[PDB]
Structure 1
């Protein structure tokens, strides 16, 4: 069947075969590339009979394979949330592991890998890096001393290929180290969880813990504060608080933030200004074209910071 598949791929065309290979596994792609150029057999009847049998064998491949991962990702996103969808997708991806330990090295935490391969010879480090995922390798070099970082980067630039025996030896060595080791450190509770925990305790303890965190690190405290009140609880803000905050919100920034906001939030926020102002805002939103989320997120962050400052001052409330 492989020879027939190779013949069909060759007869299909360069673009279709390239797309199929991009949608095919490494071993399958290599076998198809080798066999097609190696020996190609065309049969007046047997090939046609095999093609007809393949085309009639099942209709299952056309649908399930058309959309499998995208549907699962959309379901995970819509089910619980973006944060839980990321964890579910990570678990699903980790369900399919890698045999050779070199690839298993990129599922490890960057510092664990950096500690594991710091003492190795610089060329061996370099060999691991080009086999390792680029993102991971960059993090590893970031954790590496500057001298070792420069040396390994230079080795990466002028790499000259490994002997198969040495590569196999490194593979088997690395396998004996990672296959025994547990390779799925479960991370439960980051800053979203910390913010949720903080939001449910007393105000005095809330301010004590946030100021303690700020003393430890200001960036972590600000991230906790931002995760504390997301751009979705504004619907629960009082009308008087919304009207008070409207006096310090720029019309352009507010429109940019509310362009991607929920219609209910826009309706709630449009009841605090004048009728003419509400009509002007609605017309501007209708006339505003699609924009990148990078600027809308910044505008929403500025609006939330202003609202939080007003609330901290004591000129806003919720309900």
Structure 2
């Protein structure tokens, strides 16, 4: 694959540091280091490839660049020269911060409302008020709902008080918030991943760690057990969903997993069978005894894997 980002990357690794420095100063740290690694280790070089890269650069120069004067590269310096020639007020610099602020406001709208809230909860309530006013109404309502009641009411009250609509101080406020997400994204919290990791573990060790974390913190252990939970009760799992998964899942696999599963689980899973399938499954459960628990757990894990596959499809909310 060669995306528009990747085409520019190939251009850079082909041309050299003379334009790479300008690209870096107009670029971001991770892509700078990616091109540095590309320079350190390169195996995408070919006699035709390099010429095609030059042709693609010429296309960018005649289209994306349109053979124009430096775009905000040397122009910003002449803009600063005009600013210096005019009153001693760096409005252009304030506009630069506003540009990042407006882009950050759009990013804030894109990114998760609760993460935005907890990144702004520590900040000033007036900061929260003005940023919520300047944000999209839908994103603002999402963050409002994700706020606690008292903080939310204070934010709306200070929104009502907010009339100063200030002017360059607002831009640097957003810049500080962006810098508090500018740091490496991380997001390795994996609130689901503990649960996911324990599910990936063996079932007996899963139960042992569940008991251990119940001793550690009933709250955290209960959250982990909830993350273990996958189609255990019909009302939360949704019958239509039990209907859709289990026709995709092999009937024999469901049977083997059910005869090792609890009778409530058997009943709630068979309630979404075609009646012939439910009767056949129950009759075979009566016929054959509990097969090896290893095979029963294998069928249960296959059921969970198909649940995860349909979660990947995203047509309905699993449990």
For the 8 Å contact 2:97–2:171, the answer to whether it is kept is no
The structure-2 alpha-carbon separation of the partners of 1:250 and 1:117, relative to structure 1 and needing over 3 Å to count, comes to closer
Tell me what 2:170 maps to: 170
In 1, Cα distance between the equivalents of 2:265 and 2:192? 23
Greater Cα offset, 286-295 or 92-101: 286-295
In 1, Cα distance between the equivalents of 2:309 and 2:8? 66
The structure-2 alpha-carbon separation of the partners of 1:305 and 1:278, relative to structure 1 and needing over 3 Å to count, comes to same
- Counterpart secondary structure, 2:289: coil
TM-score normalised to structure 2 length: 0.34
Tell me what 2:297 maps to: 297
Distance apart, 1:193 and its partner CA: 3.0
The structure-2 alpha-carbon separation of the partners of 1:42 and 1:91, relative to structure 1 and needing over 3 Å to count, comes to same
For the 8 Å contact 2:14–2:50, the answer to whether it is kept is no
In 2, Cα distance between the equivalents of 1:30 and 1:153? 43
- Counterpart secondary structure, 1:64: coil
Distance apart, 1:170 and its partner CA: 1.0
For the 8 Å contact 2:247–2:273, the answer to whether it is kept is no
Greater Cα offset, 106-115 or 41-50: 41-50
The structure-2 alpha-carbon separation of the partners of 1:109 and 1:290, relative to structure 1 and needing over 3 Å to count, comes to farther
For the 8 Å contact 2:210–2:221, the answer to whether it is kept is yes
For the 8 Å contact 1:129–1:137, the answer to whether it is kept is yes
Greater Cα offset, 277-286 or 307-316: 307-316
Structure 1 stretches of 5 or more lacking a match? Answer: none
For the 8 Å contact 1:270–1:278, the answer to whether it is kept is yes
For the 8 Å contact 2:257–2:297, the answer to whether it is kept is yes
For the 8 Å contact 1:242–1:272, the answer to whether it is kept is yes
Distance apart, 1:127 and its partner CA: 1.1
For the 8 Å contact 1:97–1:104, the answer to whether it is kept is no
TM-score normalised to structure 1 length: 0.34
The structure-2 alpha-carbon separation of the partners of 1:38 and 1:7, relative to structure 1 and needing over 3 Å to count, comes to same
- Counterpart secondary structure, 1:141: helix
Structure 2 stretches of 5 or more lacking a match? Answer: none
The structure-2 alpha-carbon separation of the partners of 1:159 and 1:45, relative to structure 1 and needing over 3 Å to count, comes to farther
Greater Cα offset, 45-54 or 92-101: 45-54
Distance apart, 1:312 and its partner CA: 29
Q: Deviations over 1:156-188 (max 9, x none)?
A: 24654725xxx4431144326635862552334
For the 8 Å contact 1:104–1:178, the answer to whether it is kept is no
Distance apart, 1:146 and its partner CA: 7.0
Distance apart, 1:128 and its partner CA: 1.2
For the 8 Å contact 1:256–1:296, the answer to whether it is kept is yes
What is the count of residue pairs matched by the alignment? 316
- Counterpart secondary structure, 1:70: coil
- Counterpart secondary structure, 2:180: coil
Greater Cα offset, 120-129 or 238-247: 238-247
In 2, Cα distance between the equivalents of 1:217 and 1:307? 29
Superposition CA RMSD, Å: 19.9
In 2, Cα distance between the equivalents of 1:278 and 1:84? 83
The structure-2 alpha-carbon separation of the partners of 1:55 and 1:233, relative to structure 1 and needing over 3 Å to count, comes to farther
The structure-2 alpha-carbon separation of the partners of 1:117 and 1:227, relative to structure 1 and needing over 3 Å to count, comes to closer
For the 8 Å contact 1:10–1:36, the answer to whether it is kept is yes
The structure-2 alpha-carbon separation of the partners of 1:293 and 1:18, relative to structure 1 and needing over 3 Å to count, comes to farther
